[PDB]
Design an enzyme around this catalytic site. Structure first.
Site, mmCIF file in Angstrom:
data_model
loop_
_atom_site.group_PDB
_atom_site.id
_atom_site.type_symbol
_atom_site.label_atom_id
_atom_site.label_comp_id
_atom_site.label_asym_id
_atom_site.label_seq_id
_atom_site.Cartn_x
_atom_site.Cartn_y
_atom_site.Cartn_z
ATOM 1 N N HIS A 197 9.100 0.077 1.549
ATOM 2 C CA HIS A 197 9.778 -0.695 2.899
ATOM 3 C C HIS A 197 11.320 -0.363 3.015
ATOM 4 C CE1 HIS A 197 5.997 -3.137 3.008
ATOM 5 N NE2 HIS A 197 6.244 -3.032 4.111
ATOM 6 N N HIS A 207 10.676 4.297 5.858
ATOM 7 C CA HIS A 207 9.666 3.739 6.303
ATOM 8 C C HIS A 207 10.076 3.346 7.798
ATOM 9 C CE1 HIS A 207 6.485 1.211 7.681
ATOM 10 N NE2 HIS A 207 7.284 0.150 7.590
ATOM 11 N N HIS A 253 12.756 -3.446 12.018
ATOM 12 C CA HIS A 253 11.750 -4.416 11.573
ATOM 13 C C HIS A 253 11.538 -5.013 10.289
ATOM 14 C CE1 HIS A 253 9.225 -0.930 10.763
ATOM 15 N NE2 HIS A 253 8.401 -1.653 10.131
ATOM 16 N N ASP A 254 12.199 -3.828 9.162
ATOM 17 C CA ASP A 254 12.158 -4.239 7.594
ATOM 18 C C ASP A 254 13.363 -4.522 7.188
ATOM 19 O OD1 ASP A 254 9.158 -4.842 7.090
ATOM 20 O OD2 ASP A 254 9.060 -2.482 7.007
ATOM 21 N N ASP A 262 4.068 0.568 12.692
ATOM 22 C CA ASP A 262 4.275 0.204 11.291
ATOM 23 C C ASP A 262 3.145 0.622 10.196
ATOM 24 O OD1 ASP A 262 5.552 -1.049 9.362
ATOM 25 O OD2 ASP A 262 4.678 -3.059 9.834
ATOM 26 N N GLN A 267 -8.385 0.881 0.208
ATOM 27 C CA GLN A 267 -7.911 1.384 1.439
ATOM 28 C C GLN A 267 -9.139 1.698 2.536
ATOM 29 O OE1 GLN A 267 -4.969 1.514 2.111
ATOM 30 N NE2 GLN A 267 -4.030 3.744 1.840
HETATM 31 C C1 LIG Z 1 -2.270 1.806 -1.497
HETATM 32 C C2 LIG Z 1 -1.939 0.307 -1.863
HETATM 33 C C3 LIG Z 1 -3.500 -0.266 -1.791
HETATM 34 O O1 LIG Z 1 -3.957 -0.344 -0.511
HETATM 35 C C4 LIG Z 1 -5.092 -1.296 -0.448
HETATM 36 C C5 LIG Z 1 -5.159 -1.245 1.110
HETATM 37 N N1 LIG Z 1 -4.504 -2.463 1.495
HETATM 38 C C6 LIG Z 1 -4.811 -3.809 1.283
HETATM 39 O O2 LIG Z 1 -6.176 -4.102 0.670
HETATM 40 N N2 LIG Z 1 -4.087 -4.933 1.614
HETATM 41 C C7 LIG Z 1 -3.037 -4.784 2.382
HETATM 42 N N3 LIG Z 1 -2.133 -5.877 2.492
HETATM 43 C C8 LIG Z 1 -2.552 -7.108 2.203
HETATM 44 C C9 LIG Z 1 -3.828 -7.837 2.809
HETATM 45 O O3 LIG Z 1 -3.824 -7.709 4.459
HETATM 46 C C10 LIG Z 1 -4.870 -8.244 4.933
HETATM 47 C C11 LIG Z 1 -6.081 -7.126 4.826
HETATM 48 C C12 LIG Z 1 -4.574 -8.405 6.392
HETATM 49 C C13 LIG Z 1 -2.480 -3.452 2.607
HETATM 50 C C14 LIG Z 1 -1.356 -3.124 3.286
HETATM 51 N N4 LIG Z 1 -0.865 -2.021 3.413
HETATM 52 C C15 LIG Z 1 -1.653 -0.676 3.094
HETATM 53 C C16 LIG Z 1 -1.111 0.419 3.587
HETATM 54 C C17 LIG Z 1 -0.362 0.841 4.784
HETATM 55 C C18 LIG Z 1 0.197 1.788 5.239
HETATM 56 C C19 LIG Z 1 -0.208 3.099 4.211
HETATM 57 O O4 LIG Z 1 0.012 4.089 4.539
HETATM 58 C C20 LIG Z 1 -0.246 5.424 3.684
HETATM 59 N N5 LIG Z 1 -0.993 2.855 3.174
HETATM 60 C C21 LIG Z 1 -1.539 1.523 2.740
HETATM 61 C C22 LIG Z 1 -2.830 -1.173 2.494
HETATM 62 C C23 LIG Z 1 -3.226 -2.155 2.145
HETATM 63 MG MG LIG Z 2 7.347 -5.934 7.525
HETATM 64 ZN ZN LIG Z 3 7.260 -1.935 8.308
#
Ligand SMILES: CCCOCCn1c(=O)nc(NCCOC(C)C)c2cnc(-c3ccc(OC)nc3)cc21
Ligand SMILES: [Mg+2]
Ligand SMILES: [Zn+2]
Length: 324
Positions: free
Chosen positions: A78, A82, A118-119, A230, A283
């Protein structure tokens, strides 16, 4: 810095074609910080915002540099890159994705500013962490979308700063409307608000009741578009998406280290470097539960947004091959 303003304001701005900013597949990796600022001016220019809103070149340049400066360089994901990529995805969705056709110049102006802002000053820790550590920010905004309210406060601060008032030329009614749209668009970046509101959006599309002329539906659509931009790094060609996922994981694990040291807790799997083994399965789950339906809905809105959905599906298949 006055020197950096001069370097940017006196530079020739390359075309959108040269900078490849119309591409959904765009990568900022090879660009210098000055090049990301030139890309940003080009985004405002080609969306007819500089001309339409009679924006002073020097003021726009100062504002971009002030936004960039207000992102922390010790935050893995962030950060300015990004926010820049989010704005580039907004530009690509508006141009290549043909979203521009469906919105007013005022909405486009607000969306681009919100995407870049936004961030702002993201600390590299979640809303839950700020409530947990009893941070002053969590108290300021009653534990509700703490970071998002703070990002808008930082956005307003920059917009109100001498020499950075890119909205100074707007009429009072246009100015008030734009700030309201910016505030709503930034708050929309809280994934908890996306989950809360998406059902209504998907139902409007499913029933063919989606009408951009309805003000409540317009706001709902802008919120969904903010989330789509985002999360858009998740839709990039595999090698680009994999490098950004490494940064996402680094930031989450950095928070986990802070939780272990400051609070003495075992972090959640997402924030726990010792449980890095969960990344591919997590993921897949996240793409399936959060991402796919959003990119599907945006494609139903404008067929030209299909590359975002296509890239998301391809990435889901790749993460699944790693998790299985
Ligand atoms: C890579 C790290 C591990 O990610 C695991 C999956 N994962 C997750 O389980 N939870 C997230 N947020 C919190 C829970 O949210 C709930 C479900 C609503 C979460 C947030 N952002 C990403 C993300 C974004 C962009 C992106 O671009 C490449 N790669 C990964 C992945 C995310
Ligand atoms: Mg944000
Ligand atoms: Zn963002």
């Amino acid at each position: 810095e006055t020197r950096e303003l001069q370097s940017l304001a006196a530079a020739v701005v390359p075309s959108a074609q040269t900078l490849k900013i119309t591409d959904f597949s765009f990568s900022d990796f090879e660009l210098s910080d000055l090049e990301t600022a030139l890309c940003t001016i080009r985004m405002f220019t080609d969306l007819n915002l500089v001309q339409n809103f009679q924006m002073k070149h020097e003021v726009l340049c100062r504002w971009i540099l002030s936004v960039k400066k207000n992102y922390r360089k010790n935050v893995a994901y962030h950060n300015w890159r990004h926010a820049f990529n989010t704005a580039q995805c907004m530009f690509a969705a508006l141009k290549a994705g043909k979203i521009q056709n469906k919105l007013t110049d005022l909405e486009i102006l607000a969306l681009l500013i919100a995407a870049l802002s936004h961030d702002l000053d993201h600390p590299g820790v979640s809303n839950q962490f700020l409530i947990n550590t009893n941070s002053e920010l969590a108290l300021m905004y009653n534990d509700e979308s703490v970071l998002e309210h703070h990002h808008f406060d930082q956005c307003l601060m920059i917009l109100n700063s001498p020499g950075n008032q890119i909205l100074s030329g707007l009429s009072i009614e246009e100015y008030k409307t734009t700030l309201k749209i910016i505030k709503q668009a930034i708050l929309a970046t809280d994934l908890a608000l996306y989950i809360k509101r998406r059902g209504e959006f998907f139902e409007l599309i499913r029933k063919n009741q989606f009408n951009l002329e309805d003000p409540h539906e317009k706001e709902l659509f802008l919120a969904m578009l903010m989330t789509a931009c985002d999360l858009s790094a998740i839709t990039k060609p595999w090698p680009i998406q994999q490098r950004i996922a490494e940064l996402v994981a680094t930031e989450f694990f950095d928070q986990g280290d802070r939780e272990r040291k400051e609070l003495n807790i075992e972090p959640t799997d997402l924030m726990n470097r010792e449980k890095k083994n969960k990344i591919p399965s997590m993921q897949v789950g996240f793409i399936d539960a959060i991402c796919l339906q959003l990119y599907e809905a945006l494609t139903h809105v404008s067929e030209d947004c299909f590359p975002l959905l296509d890239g998301c599906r391809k990435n889901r298949q790749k993460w699944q091959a790693l998790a299985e």
